[model samples]
Target: DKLSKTDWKIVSFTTEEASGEGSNNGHAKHLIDGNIETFWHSRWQGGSDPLPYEIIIDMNHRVKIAQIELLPRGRGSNNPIKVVRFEASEDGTNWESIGQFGFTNQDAALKYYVKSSTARYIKLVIPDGVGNGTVAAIRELDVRGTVVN
Candidate 1:
């Protein structure tokens, strides 16, 4: 694994509110400094399933996502997150969905987003419930978008 040379800073933790408008969707959960853990209801069907969570980061500068690693852990007998999508923003307000995947195991996926542009933030929107049953868990998510200079 190679490290990227880019500058980035988190803008806000939109746990259950990744829309950036702070709307409670009950599908996002993020841990804050302390005593602040957001929770979302698990909508299950039957068997092990995949759930989604969204994360929006302030790039603070123009960068290209060199790689993305999603560490999804089983909170129970369900499978790890199997689907995910990555998006970009130029003004931190309006986001444009650019990349996505489906039925993928817990792993890391690399991306470039072309040359790159002056994006203020990057958003990762997660949709819960996959496969057969419902899921109640997911581990850490790391996004490696790079700076284009």
Candidate 2:
């Protein structure tokens, strides 16, 4: 199921820090805004920062993760995230990995079935983008988990 906007929050992200704070960009908070038309992008115009980006999400409650889904920018982009590493934590510190995964550069959403774990914070790291490009962008992110609290 989808996370309640009232119960979820974007803790931190590097898209704007590493990229540029340009117009219509660096809005990583929209990754889970439930709309696929808008998106967050790594600064490519002037920033041109490399990949291996990071975004953190706090569920605000303990959740036993089932599957996570991601959707790249729907149009006008080539730097769709392909290689990503997932990590989770019960507390803010002492994180454990859910493993890395690879997907195609299509606009379709891809689901990652993670190892069962209880966590309140979920961390996402994009290590590589398609075509060796440094541009990392996403339009949506969904976490399907069993909430414990």
Candidate 3:
């Protein structure tokens, strides 16, 4: 069998706050809309205010995930996702930490390899410890691995 790309569905998209400045809803689906030009931006009126956010992905089935790729919004973006921790779960309620990583100055996809886990759900958590930015944003996210029957 060969490894296949995981089809990601934004099962749950949440942020600490929503910014109406960029988009009306400031929806999280923007991060998965397969467009690099559009992005998900957090609410920050005063400027340089930190907020925690999370994104949950439904892989549709249990899959052996090896790597996750995140594409940051281009240089025009004021606040981009800098640090994040990943978790995996069979059921959405329970989760296990995959790892923590940092990304920056990235106009391209930043890849991170995690301990292989077969899970149907994946969570991306931007914790408070990641205080590097005022608002966090992501252009796109990709999960790469093999689906197990």
Candidate 4:
């Protein structure tokens, strides 16, 4: 589906969408907010082609990330992601795994229960996709946590 051409800043680009649970829906979505925007696919379910999107992070001088929210672009039984890991990077090339989350079915969004790690580049690596032909989509990417002490 050709979307209306709009100026988008590129964040992460990959060849495949990660696979998650079959029933879980909220777990398999990219994030976007006033701080963080854009993501990529880490798992290849059945999507053999490469799609790209731009990612932008909320730069409020300095901010803390505690929680993140993702919204799906498509729908189905395997439309939700299963497992994922949160990572942070300073150079955007090297990444540090900060937190992790998971979901079973079309349940609520997975909460990354762990310490918040500060970084310049934050990414949600989904080593698994959702359904058979499910491409992960996100309405927002929220980074919630204490920004300062």
Candidate 5:
């Protein structure tokens, strides 16, 4: 069995604010399209003050998450991902911040483990600033878990 072959659904997607381009070309769907070449780029315009770009994912049902991986723009590119915050929710309204992780220039998966956190929705928040203010791209988001129902 391959986790890459798992079925994932994008129930809803949004950003903290509107993109700088004024259009949604790099939509949230790109995050789960299973294509590393495609990405969801954010619009930060200038400074780091307007950050904490969030990506919300809906699993369609409750599941105990085992591991979650967040990949940068390129597999081994220096995209400047200083810090990461992971959160989870069951009802999509109430959220609980699970952990805050960090990254460097490593050509590996930025993975985190969950001790059976049953969630219908999972959120990834990038609060820290990147090297470039107008650049925030995610290559792919991989979530692995077991259905709890």
Candidate 6:
């Protein structure tokens, strides 16, 4: 099952969509806002920054995660990511990677299965965009596993 977005927090990120469109249109918060229509966009208004963007989330509680999911924007474009490196950590430093994964830029979300690991922090390092995109964008991110109590 997919982990709930409740209590999840965006600890850090490379950039977010903040110009040209509505303030909430591409904000990083949209990545877990439970709304596919909304999404997070990289700094594209002022600069269509190159690929290799990243975002980190804190689950608040340690979780033994085995799967991670990412949903590209509702619409297809170059901004959606092509490959992402999934990583986790307990103290937000000295991270360990679960593995690198890829997405097809489809409307439906993509889930990646990895060896179970317990951690409170989840980090995503996106290295490339679909179709050689220029920016990074995502609609939702989810993870599944038992919570460490």
Find the candidate with the highest TM-score and give its number: 6
Write model 3 residue lDDT over 38-115, tens digit each, in one string: 666655554534446678878677888888877776686566556888999988889999999987756888888877
| TM-score versus the correct structure, for each prediction | 0.50, 0.84, 0.79, 0.52, 0.74, 0.89
Q: Please identify model 2 stretches exceeding 4 Å from their true place.
A: 17-26, 128-132
Q: Which residue pairs overlap in candidate 1's backbone?
A: 16-28, 46-133, 47-133, 51-128, 52-128, 64-146, 65-145
lDDT of 2 by residue, 1-149 (tens): 76564667889876642335344445777776776666677666565666667889987888888988888765555765557889999997889999788866676888998888899999988775444356677777788877895
**Worst-scoring 10-residue span by lDDT in model 5:** 16-25
- Candidate 2 residue 41 Cα shift, in angstroms, is 0.9
Residue pairs with clashing backbones, model 2: none
Per-residue lDDT tens digits for candidate 6, residues 23-142, read 768887788788878888887787776766778998888899989988887464765456778889988897998988776767787889966888999988877644546666788898
Clashes (backbone N, CA, C under 3 Å), per candidate, total 7, 0, 0, 33, 0, 0
- lDDT of each prediction vs. the true structure? 0.46, 0.75, 0.71, 0.44, 0.66, 0.80
Q: Candidate 1, which segments miss by more than 4 Å at Cα?
A: 1-53, 74-80, 103-118, 128-138
Best to worst by TM-score, what's the order?
A: 6, 2, 3, 5, 4, 1
* Candidate 3 segments exceeding 4 Å error: 1-7, 16-26, 45-50
- TM for candidate 3 is 0.79
- lDDT-best of 1 and 3: 3
Clashing pairs for predicted structure model 5, backbone only? none
* Tens digit of per-residue lDDT, candidate 5, span 1-149: 11452465555543421454345435566777777666666644553334656788886767777887876765555467677777899998998887777755355556876445778888878774543333566767877777776
At residue 85, candidate 4 shows an lDDT of: 60
What's the ranking of the predictions by lDDT, best on top?
6, 2, 3, 5, 1, 4
